[PDB]
Nucleic acid binder design. Structure first.
Lengths: 79, 127, 101, 151, 98, 114
RNA sequence: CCGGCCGGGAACUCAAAGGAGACUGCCAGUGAUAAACUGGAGGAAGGUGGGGAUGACGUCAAGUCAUCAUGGCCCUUACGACCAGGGCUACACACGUGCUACAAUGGCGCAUACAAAGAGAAGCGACCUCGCGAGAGCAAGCGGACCUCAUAAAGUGCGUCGUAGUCCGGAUUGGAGUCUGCAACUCGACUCCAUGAAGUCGGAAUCGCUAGUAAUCGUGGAUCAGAAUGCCACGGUGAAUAC
RNA sequence: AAGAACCUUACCUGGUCUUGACAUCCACGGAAGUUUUCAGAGAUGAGAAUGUGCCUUCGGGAACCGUGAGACAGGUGCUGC
């Protein structure tokens, strides 16, 4: 819907993702960049996205690619 | 030879040159029937021309800018009445006992602060 | 009026005019529809994070110069509405009298 | 008002053959300030009624109006206590205007095809005194003639 | 030839500024065109007179910018330099273009 | 007049009739008629069957009632399967595009019964 | 090449200044021969011509020490300071303010004519090429009565729609795209593809308006990187009633 | 509030800083400034190359930056009774 030219990601996030990928399965990676998209190469990681006070781990899937990380971090808890 | 009236009504401003000849009206390189003669208020310019006939006395080269259809037409009317000066008060005494000389400014009032369109308050409510 | 926020804002202005307005080509010229469609533009947007979260012109709130108020600001005089009225009535602003028509 | 004893305004005569009453009729036809369209509808209905009944534009209206022209209206004038109705004669300047208002109100409803057709049918109906404006006139005359005890 | 455009805020100052700048160039540099009106620019502003609620109360100010063209026709020696280094009667932005 | 599934229209122009099909509106209908060589002023009462055949073999190019319905259902089901914010709003029955839920947003929330 | 495009002028429109005029000025009647009211003549304007700013001693021990200044109470290894993310946009509900409508004096497609006031330079952005489109690429003019914003809409004519929840209505929804911004999920706007809702004039009750006012239609500006149906201002058509 | 994506922000979670981000005094050492790499959510810590004048009281000065104590700074914290 926006940013026609290339997805957006953070330097720390991309570096840590490539490192963990070339290293193998690792503990959940604590991330704070909900503004970032999801590459196809990150499928399998259990990264933990910040929701505002805690970090929710999410298992990246092949469908969870075009969307961002914040789409799966419910912030406002109602009832 | 050729006399002049200015004319203006509601943001309009005209220039009516009046010359003895045919009974035609050439306004802004367009005729009166195709300028606004097809809409309503078709004879707001011909109204002050039956008490003193126009069919075969003289024609008018007219220009007008500013305002809208009826505004420019009333400006043309006032310009005609002001240009009828080579036939001076000798005819205006009759032209005035039916109007056609009152400038009739009555401009649109400015929008007031806190209001909506200078009179419509913003929907008062008690509680 | 939160001298902390005022110092923060002047720091933003300094850092922004220092970094951007001079190196804006990294996002204005390289991000172009040309032969740079390859990893060049990817590395361009990658280095676009080289600069801190600040340094951008959109984080400039344009507060008042006397008080530092964020709301009611006029880009013409650089002051908020309260202070611009005060100065106008005291006679500081030239040509600015009460309008009536 | 309370102190202003000002009178009525002098409206502009009709752009067609000179007439003030049908000019007022046109003035009371207009919504959103569109006067050109109201004049077009009025002229259409006038021609449709003149060609159908045989009379002309100015005469036809007159016959129809007088059939819806009320005699007396009831209005609340309480005098120290009870609040009752008082039937009274209405001025002519308001009488004709109210007749035309009832005409236009009856024409707003009863949608045949268009506004001009609506109004021409309503005028034809008031001509023989069997329309809806005449029904409103009769409702007013029934409200009167029953509470005439208060005078 | 010499396009002199002068703008100010107060008319009862800019008018006499134009009068002096025109007679100090026509008495020796005549064939001038005079103070063309160049209509005024009115920058209006509507602010709130209160720092809080009661928005309906607003103050309306404006600044007028009166302009004038002198439009000297001939670039004379009695004109080109006689226009310069004579910048008194301040409060008026004058712009000379060749 | 047995085009895609429905499209039974009587005394309506070609485009106003094709708008009866779930999957083709106004611009798409005009494009269908432009590619078939049909005018937008004729009705189904006058259009011959030799041209109903062109309508058939042309409207088949775009997604249709069943295909479009199943695509929409599959998209909504994929969202509810991923469980994103959009899927959560879909399951809770609330607007998705950030509309006002405090006072407005009554259509997607349901009638104002309570 | 009929574009005031070019010579040519300060007549005309517009334009910024300085003046005139409208001030119960004159007449008739009424009124305590006073004030004043009514009517009339000239006049564009009759009686504070139209509109605006201008807000009396004081009341509400009203609102703001969160715009700002300051008495005192407190923290002053903190209630001070920096930063990533989130929220101020959350929703079983109630209310206020507006927009959109509920359709035929109207919706849709086409051809046409008439405005005022304003903004503009790390911005307005001609012209040309691409797309149904939002916009993109090259790139003149303009710190401005020349350049841009910027095509004014209602209105006029033509053809369709036959009173149907219907071509009125546009809410919500899935994919894709355009623009600002470092990043548009939470949380922007915009055009297109499909969808089409409730709604058929609204209970008690309640608000605005007496003139270019209401009603209706469109345009600009401040805020702003982007982001208004709000605010301010401008202009077109333009009523009814006031016993 | 003449316009909350971040900013604005004065709120919450989390990580930090502390005579302190903003202002003045003493003493000490370093021209200021510029490019760049590592870890990190960033704040930050650790670094690597460069640059050395405006006047000579010339035990250095007029700026800028690193640190120690004390006077202090700061508060959109309360009180419009």
């Amino acid at each position: 819907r926006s940013l026609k030219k290339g997805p957006f990601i953070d330097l720390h996030l991309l570096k840590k993702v490539e490192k963990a990928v070339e290293s193998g399965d690792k503990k959940p990676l604590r991330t704070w960049s909900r503004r970032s998209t999801i590459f196809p190469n990150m499928i399998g990681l259990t990264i933990a996205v910040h929701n505002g006070r805690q970090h929710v781990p999410v298992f990246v899937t092949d469908e969870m690619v075009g969307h961002k990380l914040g789409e799966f971090a419910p912030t406002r808890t109602y009832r | 030879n050729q006399y002049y009236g200015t004319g203006r009504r509601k943001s309009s401003a005209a220039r009516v040159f009046i010359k003895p000849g045919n009974g035609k009206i050439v306004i802004n390189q367009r005729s009166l029937e195709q300028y606004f003669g097809r809409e309503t208020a078709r004879m707001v310019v011909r109204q002050p021309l039956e008490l003193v006939d126009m069919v075969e006395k003289l024609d008018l080269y007219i220009t007008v800018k500013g305002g809208g259809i009826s505004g420019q037409a009333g400006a043309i009317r006032h310009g005609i009445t002001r240009a009828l000066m080579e036939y001076d008060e000798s005819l205006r005494s009759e032209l005035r006992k039916a109007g056609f000389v009152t400038r009739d400014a009555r401009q649109v009032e400015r929008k007031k602060v806190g209001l909506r369109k200078a009179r419509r308050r913003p929907q008062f409510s008690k509680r | 009026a939160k001298q902390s926020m005022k110092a923060r804002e002047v720091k933003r202005v300094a850092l922004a005019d220092k970094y951007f307005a001079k190196r804006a080509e990294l996002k204005a010229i390289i991000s172009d529809v040309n032969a740079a469609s390859d990893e060049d533009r990817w590395n361009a947007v990658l280095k676009l994070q080289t600069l801190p979260r600040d340094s951008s012109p959109s984080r400039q709130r344009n507060r008042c110069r006397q008080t530092g108020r964020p709301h009611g600001f006029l880009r013409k005089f650089g002051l908020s509405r309260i202070k611009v009225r005060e100065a106008a009535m005291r006679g500081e602003i030239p040509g600015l009298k009460k309008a009536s028509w | 008002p309370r102190r202003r004893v000002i009178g009525q305004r002098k409206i502009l005569p009709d752009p067609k053959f000179g007439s003030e009453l049908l000019a007022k009729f046109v003035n009371i036809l207009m919504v959103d300030g569109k006067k050109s369209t109201a004049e077009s509808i009025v002229y259409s209905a006038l021609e449709t009624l003149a060609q159908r009944s045989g009379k002309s534009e100015l005469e036809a209206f007159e016959v129809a109006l007088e059939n819806v022209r009320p005699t007396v209206e009831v209005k609340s004038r309480r005098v120290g206590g009870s609040t009752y109705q008082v039937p009274v004669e209405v001025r002519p300047v308001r009488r004709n205007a109210l007749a035309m208002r009832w005409i236009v109100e009856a024409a707003r409803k009863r949608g045949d095809k268009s506004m001009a057709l609506r109004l021409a049918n309503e005028l034809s109906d008031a001509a023989e005194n069997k329309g809806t404006a005449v029904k409103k006139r009769e409702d007013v005359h029934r409200m009167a003639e029953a509470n005439k005890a208060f005078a | 030839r010499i396009r002199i455009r002068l703008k100010a805020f107060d008319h009862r100052l800019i008018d006499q500024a134009t009068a002096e700048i025109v007679e100090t160039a026509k008495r020796t540099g005549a064939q001038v065109r005079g103070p063309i009106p160049l209509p005024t620019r009115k920058e209006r502003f509507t602010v709130l007179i209160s720092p809080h609620v009661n928005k309906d109360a607003r103050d309306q100010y404006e600044i007028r910018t009166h302009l004038r063209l002198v439009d000297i026709v001939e670039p004379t020696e009695k004109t080109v330099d006689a226009l310069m280094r004579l910048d008194l009667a301040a409060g008026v932005d004058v712009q000379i273009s060749l | 007049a047995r085009i895609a599934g429905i499209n039974i229209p009587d005394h309506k122009h070609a485009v106003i009739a094709l708008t009866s099909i779930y999957g083709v509106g106004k611009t798409r209908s005009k494009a269908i008629l432009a590619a078939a060589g049909i005018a937008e002023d004729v009705k189904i009462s006058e259009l011959s069957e030799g041209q109903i055949d062109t309508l058939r073999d042309e409207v088949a190019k775009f997604v249709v009632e069943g295909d479009l319905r199943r695509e929409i259902s599959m998209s909504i089901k994929r969202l509810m399967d991923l469980g994103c914010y959009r899927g959560l709003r879909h399951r809770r029955g609330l607007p998705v595009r950030g509309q006002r839920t405090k006072t407005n947003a009554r259509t997607r929330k349901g009638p104002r019964k309570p």
